[PDB]
Amino acid sequence: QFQPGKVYRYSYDAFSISGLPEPGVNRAGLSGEMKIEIHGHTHNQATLKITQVNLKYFLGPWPSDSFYPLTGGYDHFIQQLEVPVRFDYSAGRIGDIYAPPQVTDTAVNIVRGILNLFQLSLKKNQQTFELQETGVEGICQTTYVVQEGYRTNEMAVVKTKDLNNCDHKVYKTMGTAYAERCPTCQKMNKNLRSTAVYNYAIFDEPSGYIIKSAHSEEIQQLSVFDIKEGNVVIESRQKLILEGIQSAPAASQAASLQNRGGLMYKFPSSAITKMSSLFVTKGKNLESEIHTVLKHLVENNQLSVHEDAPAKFLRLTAFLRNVDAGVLQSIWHKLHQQKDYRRWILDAVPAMATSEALLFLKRTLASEQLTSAEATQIVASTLSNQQATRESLSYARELLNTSFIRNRPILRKTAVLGYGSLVFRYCANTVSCPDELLQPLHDLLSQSSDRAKEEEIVLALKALGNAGQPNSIKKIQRFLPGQGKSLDEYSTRVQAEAIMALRNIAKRDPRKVQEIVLPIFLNVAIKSELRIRSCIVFFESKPSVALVSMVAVRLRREPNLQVASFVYSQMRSLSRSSNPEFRDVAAACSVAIKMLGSKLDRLGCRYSKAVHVDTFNARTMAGVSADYFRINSPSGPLPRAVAAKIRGQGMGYASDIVEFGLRAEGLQELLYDWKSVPEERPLASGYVKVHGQEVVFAELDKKMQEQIGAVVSKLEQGMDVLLTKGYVVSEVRYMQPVCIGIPMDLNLLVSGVTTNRANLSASFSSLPADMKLADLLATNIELRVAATTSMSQHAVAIMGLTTDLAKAGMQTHYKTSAGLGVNGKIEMNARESNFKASLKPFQQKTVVVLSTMESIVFVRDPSGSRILPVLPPKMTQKQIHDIMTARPVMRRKQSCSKSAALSSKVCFSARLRNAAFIRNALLYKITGDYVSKVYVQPTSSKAQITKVELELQAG
Amino acid sequence: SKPKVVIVLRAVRADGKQQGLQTTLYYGLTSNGLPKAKIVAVELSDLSVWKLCAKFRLSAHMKAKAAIGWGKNCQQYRAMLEASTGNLQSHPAARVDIKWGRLPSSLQRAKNALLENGAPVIASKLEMEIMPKANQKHQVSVILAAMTPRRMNIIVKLPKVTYFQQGILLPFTF
């Protein structure tokens, strides 16, 4: 509609503000005000040129005019916004946008926010209509109402977008791969609800519809709990006003022809990891910043953890994410011989989560620079913390081919399970997993069956279990029980692992797993253990009423009582679930149970069982479920296997938290063209899964004095030991464009630093010179100790707007520091059965647990941070004025517990100031400020020492 | 088994005065094969008549008793905790009675609170039925009976009132 030869001049103002939706509390956000010109060209293109831009941040109470200039570091960005942008526009639909490569995607996305207003899908004489319409946010459901205004030719159009009903939603996530959508929980409550409404005054002119003015309003409303328990909101608004239409002289189009894609927002490369919410890294000297914070962490957490150590670790990680594997290598090279720098750096690697970390790792392992112990801590951390991409998957594959890893069993095991987890995370968001990703693992399973190596088949099945892909089902089925006339060539152990390997698969294709495991369960010729496992798999896949009924009817005549006991107890137990995730299965079990008597509930402990317990809170919309399985054998009272799992539900998703299993077949057996696979009969085996992913398993087969004189010698000479650990406990991030074309960012980061130091010096007397352990166990061993164990954990939750150079929003920060010290003497004598500790007491008030919480709104850029508390310190007999308050009131608590024997007291102090005065809602109760202290204190009796002495035996 | 354990926690004051606590764990298989244990605890000050005395007995009649005496001579304050399993009307049943003698006015607060304020609230946050009264003034009983392996009825006898609930289905067998 822009007429060739015509220049349309507009003023454009936009902002996006985050915070609690309450008048009076502080909010923060970003804003701009521009003048723009759009020149119409031929061939249904036009060029938009921004002619003046004033960038602002918002920091203050809303409504208010707390908008201020964003000052330094923006000149280059402003010059990029000012380059002409060509766009295709025909009958009101934006097509492709073209801007030079020096104009960054950030700058193009802000242009897409303006162009989004010009998307006008008007259908000539329909007053109200709807359609899936492309915008900067994606393609979503849009409804229009077209009315006649009062000037003539003029129309009022108003359109509204349901941003939760989209054929395509633009967004990026980190950290959510193991979360499984809980359909029931999502019908109870929706966590992020978004809508945008565009209001126009339009002129119907032969050239086509031209906008006289547009105003938008968009709300992104986050409910972390139920919707009535408080929300955090991002509200964005644009105002576009036509200021003039002018004839423009003889052309010579000046705009780029570099195609930057369509109107939908485009995430800058690697934005989800590189662009931090907390830290500005663009434009800084990276290697230098990394050096400074790395020095601070190493140097400041020597005797105890520095209060901010977890936040510096988060800083260190944010900077590392911005450097390649070459910079990593230059840093390692300078510090790998310093024990502490070394340790801090290898901790930082898994936390980076980028493919450059994994390349550095591959190179360090291959050049043999790490020990076995470090490699096993890290190979582990790194593979699984990856923000999986194709390069990640390649370096991970090359890693399985590394000799250093292959030559080491526990490490090869970890790397292969890890590769499976990495596949699962890459494939989690796709409809279809590319086959080549599973190739290393199907190849291992195929070569392990060809070599008839049972251990290797087990490892591959478990890893494919981790990878969780339906593409694996055909390869796994070869190892399952009952897949043909039986070609008994695999042990129960291998078959059991093949059945367990279907579990993550069932999260994506439960129907295809049910089809497999139901005939197995129903086959009365199959060993009990294997049927029971198929029943565990079946129930976790959330079967329908009819399927569960089929099982219950088959139980009326089940010949194996182990199998009957198990199934009957699983159904009875699940029928009592009160957790939404299990609602449908639990009702299926209700109905099924009516189909038989209750006599199997009389079977005792010699019989297999399953128990499900759970709990859900409707206000938090969060809950936890636990299960425990005991598979028994007729052979005896020791279980053939036991497992227990715990799972969590929240925000409409669920995840496994941790699961442990133990199997003990041999142990039992000792207490009471084809080529068969030789059965390694492990006395026992065990594994551990975290979020559904098997992270370690071990077997106990046939594992049923120079080494000590050295330690005593080491001990007599004195030992100083320090172990610190830096780590990211969880990091979840959701980013999505708001209508103005910058991304909103919801970020949960929990990191922690632990420091443990011990100085130990041992004394003995007439110890025989040819000392043995038994001589040690028979003397007076005096151990002098100076030891400290301390820990600090920070949880940061953010909702705001983020770009490389300016971030704004709301943040709640929870920090907890704990630490205890011990300086004294321990005197032991194993034969005299006497133990003795002489500890120096607390001399002064000593804080042992420090916990703070602070909710702020912030604007961060290279100039640094500007921060306000969410609850303004001040705004607007005893009881009344306190309760009937328009302001926050500091509350105070303080308990004690005196020790007479010790002349010392353990106190708990706390100061609370939150937002409950505003709304009776859970989020408002944890929003504000809080400081709590668990401390120990004297009195004056001046205890010199405090001795704990034990004496067993005859005296 | 017969053995004993002595533990002393001593705070060495400046004065040299004796300060601290001495505990002496005892244990055997007294009276008739059924395990027994005791815990005595005294202050180290020769001036002290304080004494904490705690006894356990795992009786034949599938009971488990345990008393606790503390104060003046470990007989100033008393509190027992008797637990039995068995049959109530042909149904497996179980029972715990927490009894108490004199309590230091302090603890008296905690009890009279949770028996007058706490209890009714837990009882309705669990929606239990509520009869006029259950006898004995310095006692608390809880009776559990499995009507079926998964169905249990529970009776909670407080001094001033009985709370009860029938047909509670459990997620596991009793």
Side-chain angles (χ1 to χ4, degrees), chain A residues 35 49 127 247 289 301 338 403 410 426 465 553 576 624 646 667 697 732 735 740 792 826 831 836 848 931:
Chain A
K35 289 318 203 61
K49 207 221 312 177
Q127 164 175 269
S247 277
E289 292 273 356
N301 300 91
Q338 309 295 327
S403 141
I410 293 185
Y426 186 82
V553 172
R576 293 271 89 213
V624 71
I646 170 168
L667 221 245
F697 62 100
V732 176
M735 316 186 75
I740 74 175
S792 159
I826 300 169
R831 185 223 331 185
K836 194 172 196 167
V848 295
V931 182

Side-chain angles (χ1 to χ4, degrees), chain A residues 181-189 226 539-545 548 571 573-592 612 614-619 621-622 625 647 649 652 654:
Chain A
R181 199 180 177 133
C182 163
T184 291
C185 317
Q186 301 223 297
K187 304 197 250 69
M188 288 170 74
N189 188 258
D226 176 75
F539 279 104
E540 254 177 15
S541 74
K542 299 201 177 72
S544 86
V545 202
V548 178
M571 298 192 292
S573 189
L574 276 178
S575 70
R576 293 271 89 213
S577 165
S578 56
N579 173 306
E581 179 179 9
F582 299 98
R583 215 199 286 320
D584 288 354
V585 158
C589 290
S590 182
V591 172
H612 180 82
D614 57 34
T615 190
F616 193 86
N617 184 311
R619 293 189 63 206
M621 283 306 281
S625 55
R647 175 173 186 93
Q649 296 75 30

Side-chain angles (χ1 to χ4, degrees), chain A residues 290-308:
Chain A
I290 285 183
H291 262 20
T292 304
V293 57
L294 186 57
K295 180 157 197 195
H296 198 282
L297 285 156
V298 167
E299 295 314 332
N300 295 273
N301 300 91
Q302 286 286 327
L303 292 182
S304 278
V305 182
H306 200 86
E307 159 225 4
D308 305 322

Side-chain angles (χ1 to χ4, degrees), chain A residues 143-216:
Chain A
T143 307
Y144 282 79
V145 177
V146 175
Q147 299 176 309
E148 284 16 77
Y150 17 50
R151 250 155 89 154
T152 188
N153 280 173
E154 166 180 281
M155 318 177 273
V157 174
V158 55
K159 65 178 204 184
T160 172
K161 290 188 170 259
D162 181 347
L163 297 170
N164 298 113
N165 188 9
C166 304
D167 286 358
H168 173 82
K169 202 184 161 75
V170 179
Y171 76 99
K172 271 290 176 324
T173 57
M174 160 168 246
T176 52
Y178 302 136
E180 322 169 41
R181 199 180 177 133
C182 163
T184 291
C185 317
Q186 301 223 297
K187 304 197 250 69
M188 288 170 74
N189 188 258
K190 277 311 305 211
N191 302 106
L192 177 59
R193 286 179 172 272
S194 302
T195 187
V197 174
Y198 299 81
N199 260 304
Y200 302 88
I202 278 151
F203 286 151
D204 180 7
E205 262 87 296
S207 99
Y209 303 114
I210 70 103
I211 299 164
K212 187 322 106 180
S213 58
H215 305 68
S216 68

Side-chain angles (χ1 to χ4, degrees), chain A residues 857-876:
Chain A
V857 288
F858 61 85
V859 171
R860 300 166 173 133
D861 70 357
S863 295
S865 317
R866 297 71 144 190
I867 292 162
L868 298 179
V870 171
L871 292 173
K874 282 175 197 57
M875 198 124 173
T876 300

Side-chain angles (χ1 to χ4, degrees), chain A residues 569 572-573 576 601-602 611-613 900-903 941-953, chain B residues 3-15 19-21 27 43 148-151 169-173:
Chain A
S569 65
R572 295 292 314 263
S573 189
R576 293 271 89 213
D601 261 357
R602 294 175 142 285
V611 164
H612 180 82
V613 291
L902 306 172
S903 309
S941 289
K942 273 279 144 58
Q944 188 54 67
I945 319 194
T946 286
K947 309 174 173 163
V948 190
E949 185 186 329
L950 199 179
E951 181 55 80
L952 207 176
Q953 64 117 280
Chain B
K4 296 136 90 301
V5 180
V6 173
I7 308 182
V8 172
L9 182 85
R10 171 199 309 284
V12 200
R13 295 153 124 290
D15 189 293
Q19 182 182 319
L21 212 59
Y27 63 80
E43 289 192 310
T148 79
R150 287 180 189 271
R151 299 213 207 95
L169 281 162
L170 309 167
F172 41 82
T173 29

Side-chain angles (χ1 to χ4, degrees), chain B:
Chain B
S1 299
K2 169 148 188 175
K4 296 136 90 301
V5 180
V6 173
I7 308 182
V8 172
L9 182 85
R10 171 199 309 284
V12 200
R13 295 153 124 290
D15 189 293
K17 286 178 189 173
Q18 66 294 73
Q19 182 182 319
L21 212 59
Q22 168 198 271
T23 313
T24 44
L25 177 65
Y26 300 82
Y27 63 80
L29 300 153
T30 309
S31 302
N32 56 273
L34 18 50
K36 187 167 166 188
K38 292 192 57 171
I39 308 201
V40 169
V42 302
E43 289 192 310
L44 291 181
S45 157
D46 90 313
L47 285 187
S48 189
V49 80
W50 195 84
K51 194 170 310 165
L52 185 122
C53 306
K55 326 188 183 181
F56 192 116
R57 287 194 70 80
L58 215 57
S59 281
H61 298 8
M62 184 54 249
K63 315 168 184 285
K65 314 190 182 234
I68 178 166
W70 65 118
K72 284 180 191 167
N73 289 265
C74 89
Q75 294 175 151
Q76 183 196 348
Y77 301 139
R78 289 188 308 152
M80 279 165 101
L81 179 112
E82 169 135 15
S84 343
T85 73
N87 273 55
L88 237 47
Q89 291 243 287
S90 292
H91 292 115
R95 176 176 199 144
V96 191
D97 297 2
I98 293 194
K99 320 187 225 63
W100 62 87
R102 328 297 200 103
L103 266 70
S105 295
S106 167
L107 213 60
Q108 186 72 26
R109 283 191 297 171
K111 191 221 62 202
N112 269 119
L114 306 202
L115 258 67
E116 167 185 25
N117 287 9
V121 182
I122 306 142
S124 282
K125 183 178 172 241
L126 304 183
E127 305 171 87
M128 304 193 67
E129 303 293 287
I130 310 190
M131 296 192 109
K133 168 183 167 280
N135 207 169
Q136 233 296 126
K137 300 86 72 191
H138 298 287
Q139 206 177 299
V140 158
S141 302
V142 182
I143 302 167
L144 308 132
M147 291 308 137
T148 79
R150 287 180 189 271
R151 299 213 207 95
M152 91 168 167
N153 308 343
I154 180 188
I155 306 179
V156 176
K157 298 193 189 201
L158 308 209
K160 286 184 296 74
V161 59
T162 291
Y163 295 137
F164 78 85
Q165 184 57 280
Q166 302 168 119
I168 295 180
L169 281 162
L170 309 167
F172 41 82
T173 29
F174 198 88

